[PDB]
Amino acid sequence: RLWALVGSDLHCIRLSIPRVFYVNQRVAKAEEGASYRKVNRVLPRSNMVYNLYEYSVPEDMYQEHINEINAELSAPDIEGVYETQVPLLFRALVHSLAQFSYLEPGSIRHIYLYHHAQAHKALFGIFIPSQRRASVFVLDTVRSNQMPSLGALYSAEHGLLLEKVGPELLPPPKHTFEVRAETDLKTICRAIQRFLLAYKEERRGPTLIAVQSSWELKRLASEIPVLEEFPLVPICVADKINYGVLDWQRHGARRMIRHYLNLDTCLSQAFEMSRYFHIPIGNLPEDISTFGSDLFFARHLQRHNHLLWLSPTARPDLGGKEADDNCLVMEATVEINSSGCYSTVCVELDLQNLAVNTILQS
Amino acid sequence: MAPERLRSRALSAFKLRGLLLRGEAIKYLTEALQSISELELEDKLEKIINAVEKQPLSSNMIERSVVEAAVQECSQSVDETIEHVFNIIGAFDIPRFVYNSERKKFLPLLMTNHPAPNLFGTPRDKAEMFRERYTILHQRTHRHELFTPPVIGSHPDESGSKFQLKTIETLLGSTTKIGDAIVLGMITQLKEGKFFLEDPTGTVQLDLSKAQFHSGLYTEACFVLAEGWFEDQVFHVNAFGFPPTEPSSTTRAYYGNINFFGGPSNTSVKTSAKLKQLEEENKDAMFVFLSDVWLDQVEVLEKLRIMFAGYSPAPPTCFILCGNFSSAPYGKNQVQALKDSLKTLADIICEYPDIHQSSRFVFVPGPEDPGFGSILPRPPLAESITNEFRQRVPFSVFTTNPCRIQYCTQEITVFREDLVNKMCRNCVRFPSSNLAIPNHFVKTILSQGHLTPLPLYVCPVYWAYDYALRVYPVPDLLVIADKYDPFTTTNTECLCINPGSFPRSGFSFKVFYPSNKTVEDSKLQGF
Fold first, then answer.
1. A24, A70, A348, A361: which is deepest, by most CB within 10 A?
2. What's the CA gap between B2 and A344, in Å, rounded?
3. B221: domain range?
4. How much of chain B is helix, strand and coil, in % rounded to 5?
C-alpha cells in the first residue's frame, strides 16, 4: 500500500512490482517471461571471488513467481551456480514516477500517544494539544494510582522552542491536562482500541497516530490495529527509565511534555533526510541508519549498473564461503615508548575522521 | 532358613566357581536369599552366579554392586524397560576403535598406544583423519570379489577378477603405459585444474580428460578407484568409481559382532535374541523425526500443538527434533528466544500429559544454533538454555550433533547439516541427471563411509573426533537433516531419510516404525 499526500491529510492505493530474481537462465529453464534483457550488473559475480568462480559475466533475470528454486542450477551467461536472490525491498514503481522534489510529507492532523512502561507501572500516555483529557492508565499497585499524572503531566512549563518548530502542528502546543485510569488485563488495550477509533473521528477518521515513543513492549508493531498509518514518530530508547516512576520533574515534564516537541524534531529530521534519499516517514535514521548509504550506493550501482544489495543476517552477497578467506576476520598502532623526556613539550596530537579522509586518495 | 548354613553354602557355591565375595556382598546375598529353602536355594545360587559371570568382571573378587545387579536381574525388574531398549549416544561417547593392519582387526583404544581424542589435536592427528579414512576404505576394498584367485583357482592366472589393485608408489616406476592400472586414492585439486590423486604412499597427477564415471556425486576429498594408465608422472584416467559398499551383515560376518555403533551393549545390538524379542514387544513401536523446528515462531508452536493433538492416539516412544531451531539465530536475542521456546514447549507438553509420560523428546542442534555450532561433532545446546526444560520436562535429552540413537536391535544416526548443497558446490564432475540427487548423495555417503566426504575447511571437524562422523558399518537409518529436500531412499539394508526443514516442507515431517522398519509421511501440511 502506497500512502501519499493530497491537500487533505492522506490518500492511498494498492500496488505491486515485478520482484526481480536474477534467475540467471531463460534458455533451458524458463517461466512466463524471456527477460534476458540488458545484462550489466556485474557486482554479485565480483563479490563471488570470496566464493571463487571463473569467467563470471553479469546476469539473466525473471520475477519471483514461487517460493522454490530451479534446483538444476546452471546459467547461459556462463555456466555455474549463483545466488539469484536480491529483491528484499521495493523502492520505486515500474508500471508513473515524478522527479520527487517538493516531497512536502507533513500531513496536518493526528492523535498523539505514548507507550513506555514499568512492568508494575505501565505508562500508557495520551496527551494532545486540542483535548485536555490525558492518561497514565494502569499500574500493578492496584491499591493506588499514578500520582504525578495530574500535577506534573501538567508540566507547569512550556518551552520556548515550541514557538520556533511549531508550524508542523495544526493547533498550538498546549500542556495542561487531566487524566483517567484503569487496572485489568482485559480492559486496557480493548478500551484504548475503542478510544483511539473514536478519537480519530474528532479529526475525522483517516489520520496518522503520532506515537511519541514505543519503549514499552515495542508497541510499534505489537499495538492494536491502527486502521491507517503508523508513522515512525517514536524516539529511540534514549531515556532508559526503569526506576520507580514518580520522579516526574524529568519523567513527566521532559519525558512526556518536552517530547511533544520531539514530534517536530523527529519529523523535520526525517523530512530533511528525505531530501537526500526520498523516504520521509518510514526512514531508518537514528537506528543503525545504514539505509542512507545503502540506498544511495545501490542507486549509484544502478547509474553504472552493478547491484541492488542482498542483506542476510551475516555480511555478504555471495554463496558458499571458503574459510581461508575468513581467517582475516578470525584474527599502525605503534608505541615508540619514549620513557625518557627529551624535547620537553606538552606531548600531544589527536586525529579525527580518518576513515572518510582515507577513501579520497583512491 | 538358618543364616549360618545359608552363608556357608552361598560362600561355597561362589568358591567352587572360583569367585570371592566381599563382606558386604555376602551379607546382601544372605539377606536376598533368606526367603528360600533347599527346594530352590541351590538352583537360585547357580542362576545368580551365572548372572554374575555374565557381567564384565575385572577380578575374581566381587563387590556388592555386581551381586546386586545379578540378583535384581534374577528378580527381573526389566519389565517395560527403557534401558537396553532405547539409548541416545553422544558423539563424544562413541568408542574409539582403530584398525590394526598386521592383526587385521579393530582394537579399542585402551588395548593400543593410541591417545585419547581431544579438541586441541596434534599435527599428527590432522593427517590421521584422512589416513584412517583411507585405511577403512582400503580394508573394505580388498575384501570385495576383486581379490586375487586362490591357489590354482583358475588354470590361467587372473588379474583379481580384472580388478587387481595397486598403490601410487608402486606405479611410480617401471609401469609406464601399463594399460590396466587401478589405484585407490583421494581426489585433490592440488594445483588449479591440475588434479592429483593421493594415498598414504604418495601422490600423482590425474589426467581426467575422459571420466566414464559411475553414478555418484564426485567431490574433492572423495576416495575413488581410479582405473587408467601411467606416463610422465601423470595417471591417465580411463574410469572413476567409488569403492563398493558392504552391508552390515557382511562386515559383522567378517569381523564378528563388534559393537561399532556404540552404546551399553558389548556385542552388536543387531544380534541378540532377547533384544529381538524386546524390539517387537510393542507392535506399533514408533518414533517421530523433525528438523529446523523454529520455535521462536508462534506459528511453529501452534502447529506443534496440532501435531500433539494428531498424535495423542498412539504416541511415539520419542520425538526427535533436529536443529536449526530458529528463524533468527542471531545471538543473545536467540539465547533468550530459545529459553522462551523451551518454556512454551514445556507448557504445551504439560497441556498433553499423556504424551509427556508416553514419549521422550530429544534435540540435535544445528550449526547456526547458539554455542559451538560451526565445528563438528557439535556439543549439545547450552545447559543454561536447557535448565528450565531439564527440570520441567525430565523426559528429554539435549545431545550432540551428530548423535547416535539405538532402539533395541536397530541403529539410527541423526545429523543436522545442509550437506547436499555443500557437496554439489564442491563437485568435481557434474553428475548425470538420470539418477536423482538424494540417491547420488546417499550412494556417495555410503560408499565413502563418512558423513563429511569433503575438505576440512568445507566441513570443520575436531581432528581426533573425526571417527565419530564415520558411517561404518552401514546402520539401519541415516537421518540426514538437510534443507535441500525431504526424502526417503535405501541401500545396503539402510533407509536413508531426510525430514527436510519443517518451515519449508510445509510443516511435513517423518514417522518411523522399527518393529517393521517402515517409514511413513507425516503429511500434516494443512494442520
1. A24
2. 103
3. 163-242
4. 30, 20, 45
